[PDB]
Amino acid sequence: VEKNITVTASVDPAIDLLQADGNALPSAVKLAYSPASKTFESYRVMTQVHTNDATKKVIVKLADTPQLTDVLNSTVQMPISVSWGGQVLSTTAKEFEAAALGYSASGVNGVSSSQELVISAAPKTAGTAPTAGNYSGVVSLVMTLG
Amino acid sequence: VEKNITVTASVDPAIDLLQADGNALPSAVKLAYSPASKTFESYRVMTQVHTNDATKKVIVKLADTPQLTDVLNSTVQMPISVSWGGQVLSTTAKEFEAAALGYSASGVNGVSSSQELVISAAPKTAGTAPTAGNYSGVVSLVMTLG
Amino acid sequence: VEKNITVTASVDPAIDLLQADGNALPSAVKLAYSPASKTFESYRVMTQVHTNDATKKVIVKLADTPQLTDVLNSTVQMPISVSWGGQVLSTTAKEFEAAALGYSASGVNGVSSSQELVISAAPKTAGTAPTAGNYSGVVSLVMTLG
Amino acid sequence: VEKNITVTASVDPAIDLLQADGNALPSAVKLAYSPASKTFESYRVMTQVHTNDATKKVIVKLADTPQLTDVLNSTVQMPISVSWGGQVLSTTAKEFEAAALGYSASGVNGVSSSQELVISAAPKTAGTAPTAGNYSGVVSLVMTLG
Amino acid sequence: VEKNITVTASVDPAIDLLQADGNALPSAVKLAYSPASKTFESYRVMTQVHTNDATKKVIVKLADTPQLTDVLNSTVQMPISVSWGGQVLSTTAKEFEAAALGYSASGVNGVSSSQELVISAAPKTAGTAPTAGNYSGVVSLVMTLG
Amino acid sequence: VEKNITVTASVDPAIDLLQADGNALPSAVKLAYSPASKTFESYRVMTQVHTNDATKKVIVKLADTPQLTDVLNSTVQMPISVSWGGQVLSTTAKEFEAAALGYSASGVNGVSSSQELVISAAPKTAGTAPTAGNYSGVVSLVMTLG
Amino acid sequence: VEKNITVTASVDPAIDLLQADGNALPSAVKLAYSPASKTFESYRVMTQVHTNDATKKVIVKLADTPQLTDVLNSTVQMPISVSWGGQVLSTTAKEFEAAALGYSASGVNGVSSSQELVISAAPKTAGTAPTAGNYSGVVSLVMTLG
Amino acid sequence: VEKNITVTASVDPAIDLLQADGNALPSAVKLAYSPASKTFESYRVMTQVHTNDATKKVIVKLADTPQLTDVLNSTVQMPISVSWGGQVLSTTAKEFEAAALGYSASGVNGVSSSQELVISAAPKTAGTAPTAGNYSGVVSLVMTLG
Amino acid sequence: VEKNITVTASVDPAIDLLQADGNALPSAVKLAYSPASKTFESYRVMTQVHTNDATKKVIVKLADTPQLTDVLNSTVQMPISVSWGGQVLSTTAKEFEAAALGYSASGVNGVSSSQELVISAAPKTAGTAPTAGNYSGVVSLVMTLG
Amino acid sequence: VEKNITVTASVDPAIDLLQADGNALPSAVKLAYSPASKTFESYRVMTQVHTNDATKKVIVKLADTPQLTDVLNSTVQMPISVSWGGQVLSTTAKEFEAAALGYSASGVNGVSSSQELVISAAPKTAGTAPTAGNYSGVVSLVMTLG
Amino acid sequence: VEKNITVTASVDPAIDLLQADGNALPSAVKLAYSPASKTFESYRVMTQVHTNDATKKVIVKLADTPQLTDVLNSTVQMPISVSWGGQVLSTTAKEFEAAALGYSASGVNGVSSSQELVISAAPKTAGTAPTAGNYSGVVSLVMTLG
Amino acid sequence: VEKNITVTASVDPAIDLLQADGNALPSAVKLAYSPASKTFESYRVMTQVHTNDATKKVIVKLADTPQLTDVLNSTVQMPISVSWGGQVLSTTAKEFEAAALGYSASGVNGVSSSQELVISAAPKTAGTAPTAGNYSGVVSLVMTLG
Amino acid sequence: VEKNITVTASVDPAIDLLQADGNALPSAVKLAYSPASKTFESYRVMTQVHTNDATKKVIVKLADTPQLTDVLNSTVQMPISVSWGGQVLSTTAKEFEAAALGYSASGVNGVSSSQELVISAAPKTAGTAPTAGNYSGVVSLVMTLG
């Protein structure tokens, strides 16, 4: 009754971000939208960086296009509003103090403190509800260790 | 340590239903079953419609098959009993008074009053417990603004 | 570093069926089989017809042989059980009411309501598990606009 | 504004255990740990069996591994201490008298009396606090009707 | 608007393993890695064997190479740590008692009890984080009925 | 039982583009078309350039005819809309900053950051669905290192 | 409208290797090359030997020249790295245990277990990317039944 | 640098069969053979007749010898098993209903529906694997419009 | 067992066209014809010019008669539609920019970029299917270096 | 309508070489030439010796003049580069081990394994493209059984 | 520069056989011989009779000596094995049904269907390879219209 | 063993026509005849004029009698249809532009481009097959340099 | 109807040269001439010496006048260029090794290997085309056995 399965992984020492509970982060999410408020639902997560070096500061930015579109119209576009660690992130570089994270906090060396993550996104135009339709797009959270 | 994520959304002005607390509704649920009562658990939610027009009445119905089955026998079937807003819903059209909802109620224009939602479901046959097994099926809650 | 790629497409106005989320449908699928139940896994999808004419009724049937076989024995055969839109489909013609689909539903004109799709298949014989082996076959979902 | 939802269920006549109030039981729980006492928090519930046969005695055991671990180290392990109905449960079979439960008690035939449930768990080693970290594991409460 | 689809299946009486909920098992998975712990994420599933003979004991082993590599360097290798049913599995034969599984348990004859599945994997070397890179490899879970 | 196989390859140092996961890119793709939107499906991929020189900027253009046709009428033509790296590509030369790609990002020197790829294509004429038929054509993605 | 077609085949009892799914194996393949790693892509397949005698051990080797070249320079050469069944193959004879393959495994007598196949190939020289160009060559997988 | 090329074609109005995608059909094919099943591989294609008259029924048969042989022994012979359009074909005349093909189906007038094609072939003798060797032979698919 | 073989070649410096993969081009081809579309099959190739001088522009034309006929009636004639490099070719002279070809592209000096080749051909008369019959004719692709 | 035909043949026991598929070898071939590489196209074939004695070793050489010329200038000459069976051949005698060929391989006694054949040829002078012109010459592959 | 040429022809109404493609048949052929099989190569052609009368049946036989010899020993002889139209031919008269040929088939009146032609030939003696040498002989295919 | 041989030649500067490959032209040819089409086979060659003066235009005509006859009846006659260089030739003078031939084309000065040659011939009478018999006659291709 | 015929022959043991196929050699030949190259056509044959003594070496030369002339002017003369067996021949004596010919080669004792024969001839003067005219002359190939 042999039943095979695929396995994969990705290592990248000077560890990535992870879920605060000690699991992986999502690979997807759904957001709502209320044109009575003209906002998506502000998706939120608490997360805990790990590392392999407790001093080096962590660098963050994004790829060019944190924006959605129509699943069957590539022309429609709407940006995305991202923020983590207590403030906004950009396509340009940010950098966070290692001391401001508690690597020797509750758990074990490398485990930072729990950090607020936020994924919002809004219409590009104010006072304007976008077109009725299923929309989609990807955030490619650039991040590294300085 | 770049870590990308998918995002999606769906707009449809003249807003859908939403959770009363001001969040999204469930995408899934589990129900029990007691053949000592021969009923599932009557799942319940309080919800709050939004809109983009405070006068137009809201229309409701369902798709053809609010019924479950066996996860490995498509032949087994059992209907589902749905009701919202104080009464039952059908595959045929209902319609609710806008004035009977309080769009200028506690919060802000468009926010209706909190509405009782109910998802029950029962054996198709009376005095008959169905077969032992994991069962499944989807409700496609048709709804729109008249 | 020039790297070329093939592209294709198929148009057929009075649109085909599509995935409910606003994407393409599968080109393949795998089904299980439990001879403890003597059924395949009842594969299921929610889908949304489009069109170029909101009145005309949609016609459906199948090609002659919705049946599987052995990948290395063409003699073995087992039929397939298909159903969509709330009922079974045949090699003979069905036809669905346009009004019973909600082309002016949640999204935009032409977008029907979400429709249940089902792909099951069973042994031709009752109380009979077929031969151990990888099996295969194709469904050619005839469909058009009346 | 059509918004679909998943539904599921599981039947198994000769009913499972249920919450004493007449609801479902938890699907999860959190426990603390005090190495000043070197114990988790003794989680507790009152519950009420149902059935479809008031005479047959109810059998209980567990799957092999009522033990936790580290969420990112499968090697760490610590057992779990379970007890229900007034005494301990095992990976081996127990069995409870039907008469000792009051199926004709307060409510209606089948409704047993309220039964104490207990979920504790401790370090495998005495005088030893385990490693700092989020831990996890599942109990698979085998149970049936004799 | 004819739209064809492929279908396949695989039978093998004396059934394979399946998802505990009554669905298929995954065909793929992703694991993380924290060199602060120097472990992948311990992936886990609860599963339920089926059969066509309730007495015969189930045999298990693996193919030669439960190990990963680099997607663009076949030389890199790291083993994989598998365990199911309460203990480890090997490239050599194991065998499980039928009585220790509950084929007459909650559901119906053949349906075993829910069994813990675990897929971990670690660096071959201790105190050594592997090279930064996307890695891959397959487990071919040999299994049969004794 | 000797069974021979062909092998080929193509080298071109100052590496081509590759799949972000660390595999090859597609050699083909299928696109849909909805004349309710009058768009193909916006096909998308995340990709990661490699190189042999981390400073030199990467040049891009296309061959003359990013357009489809009819498989049995060479006269029918419809252009193609391509874009990569955050913007559109042409039959004329583009050029991308090396610093804006993260060659020292998550993985190893040369591995750029993950880049959005997009393959759309539309009718040449607005408000015009093309003829019913299977269509085809090739994109020859000119690209090199400046 | 008579339209003729060629057919061929090759028998060789004591069967050759075949695709694990129950189909033929490839007649060709493409490999990449990254001089950032200085490796081709490690091509991989899972396969299942058949036979006409379940005891006899299977012998393997290769023809003299598992190496590529330039399509327009026969002088350029680079070897190929092959391995199957859990280890490397040579121009010299190997031999595999019949018992170590599971001919009475999941399917039917003769069907071995699924075996890992690997086709890699590298520059003959270390720290040396070969010349820019389309390359080619054939592997003639000698194999027989001992 | 003048480089000449041959061109040919064949017209025969009341069109021949063609590939379903809108291309030509194969001029050759290879089949396997497993004497563990004692069958070739059941080769399969989906195809779409065209015509110049939508009413007339299409006639089919074969030439005398749908059989293979040895490439260096004309005495060896083995028949071939052909079937198309949902059933078997012969050296004698068949005939298919025009209405049962959908000439006004998805595409344009004349384009029939997609039709299953099958090319199998077996040993003439049961329980008998033929001689080891490369074999060959041609099918001359007689067909016309009634 | 001496077995002799003929060899030939043709040099012409300032190289001819060649197959893009790095092989020779075809010496022949077959085209279909569908009088439901009244077109042959649009045959296509991607190709790569070479040279011995990277500046000089390449000149193209054709011989007088890019037309087919009947294999046993020289009177029947039908022209041929040729196009390469992004546009049509004639019996008169064309000329292509060297800079518009990428001789320093992916490979090595002289290797142009991949160029689309097209060989179509149609009935001389519109709304007219030619006579049933095998047809033939040659294209003599005049070409040189300006 | 009597139509006569010539037939010939050549026997020479201790068989010659033959095509690997089980057919005759070519009597002619065309080679290209790229003075951007200054090489002909490396023509290649896989072949299978036969014999009438499985032990005796096979001897090979060539006649004096494996070289081309001009079809209208006998003075022009360019040598030819031949190699078979994994290495080069000469006007002098080579000899191959019978055991190194697999006469009891896939097929039947006498049928050797598939052997790589290569026909290249180059300008006699380095850095020198020969004269523009059609060239020709014959290889007389001396070969026998030792 | 006057250059004269010979021309000839042969008419014989109630036409001879011809090549199926619409060309002449061969005037010569070469056959191999493998005394490992002790057979020549089974030469084969597909052909299409023409006529001037669609009813009359076609008669066939041969001249006395379908046999080869030595080019320098007239005493050596070996017969020839001919077959056409689905069966063997003789020095005695055969005759074929006109209706069994499709004169109103794909092309035009008179054009029969494509017919298998076969030219084999073998040693006169079994288990006997003939003498080493170039051999020759002619078949004079008697044929006419009954 | 002295063995003598005749040699001849013919010079005529301002060269004659020659075979395009760089060889002599035929001295004879055979044509078929199908009274189902009432045409001979349209014999065809590609050829390349040479010269000793690249400007002068080439003149062409024929001798009086491009017609066949019976080999044993000089009274029977049938004309011949000749055409070269893209059009018909006569017993009267034609003349071709030197510039329209490419003397500086692919090869070397004097070598014209490849020119289509055609030798057809038909019954003198329409709807009339000539007498059964071997026929013959000569074309004397007058040609010179103007 | 008595019809007589002449016969002749010539014996000369220690055999002459013969055609490689096993026939006689030509008694005549025609050569072309291109004053664009100022060469005749290089006539060529492959041939096979026989003998009556396998050791003795074969001697070759020519008679005095391997030269042509005018058929009606004996004064015009042009030499001839002969070469055989891999090199030139003279009016003086050459001699070839018996061992370098393979008398025990493919066929039977005495049959040498196939030897290249060449008959060229050129103007006596360089840069000089001879007079327009039919020319002639004989080569008397002296040859014997040393």
Author numbering:
A (entry chain I), B (entry chain K), C (entry chain E), D (entry chain M), E (entry chain G), F (entry chain C), ...: 1 to 146
Quote the study on this structure.
To attach to intestinal cells ETEC express colonization factors, among them CFA/I, which are the most prevalent factors and are the archetypical representative of class 5 pili. The bioassembly of CFA/I pili is initiated by the attachment of the chaperone/minor pilin (CfaA/CfaE) heterodimer to the usher protein CfaC at the outer membrane assembly site followed by cyclic incorporation of the major pilin, CfaB. Adhesion pili subunits are assembled into helical polymers after being chaperoned across the periplasm, transported through an usher protein that resides in the outer membrane, and pilins are then sequentially added to the growing pilus filament. This pilus assembly occurs via a ‘donor-strand exchange’ during which the N-terminal extension (NTE) of each pilin subunit is transferred from the chaperone protein to a growing chain of pilin subunits, filling an empty groove in the previous subunit. The helical quaternary structure of CFA/I can be unwound under tensile force and it has been shown that this mechanical property helps bacteria to withstand shear forces from fluid motion.
We report in this work the CFA/I pilus structure at 4.3 Å resolution from electron cryomicroscopy (cryo-EM) data, and report details of the donor strand complementation. After rigid-body fitting of the subunit’s structure determined by X-ray crystallography into the cryo-EM helical reconstruction, we used RosettaCM to refine the filament structure of CfaB based upon the cryo-EM map. CFA/I pili are assembled using the NTE of subunit n fitted into the groove created by a ‘missing β-strand’ in the previously added subunit, n − 1. Calculated from our CFA/I model using CocoMaps software the buried surface area between subunits n and n + 3 is 1087 Å2, whereas the buried surface area between n and n + 1 is 485 Å2, and between n and n + 2 is 453 Å2. Our findings suggest that quaternary structural stability for CFA/I pili is due mainly to the stacking interface formed by every n to n + 3 contact, as demonstrated by this contact having the largest buried surface area, 1087 Å2. In the current structure, Pro13 has a better fit in a trans conformation, in contrast to the expectation that a transition from trans to cis would produce the rotation required for the conformational change from a linear to a helical structure. While at our current resolution, an unambiguous fit of Pro13 into the EM map is not possible, bending of the backbone structure between Pro13 and Ala14 appears to provide the rotation necessary for assembly of the helical filament.
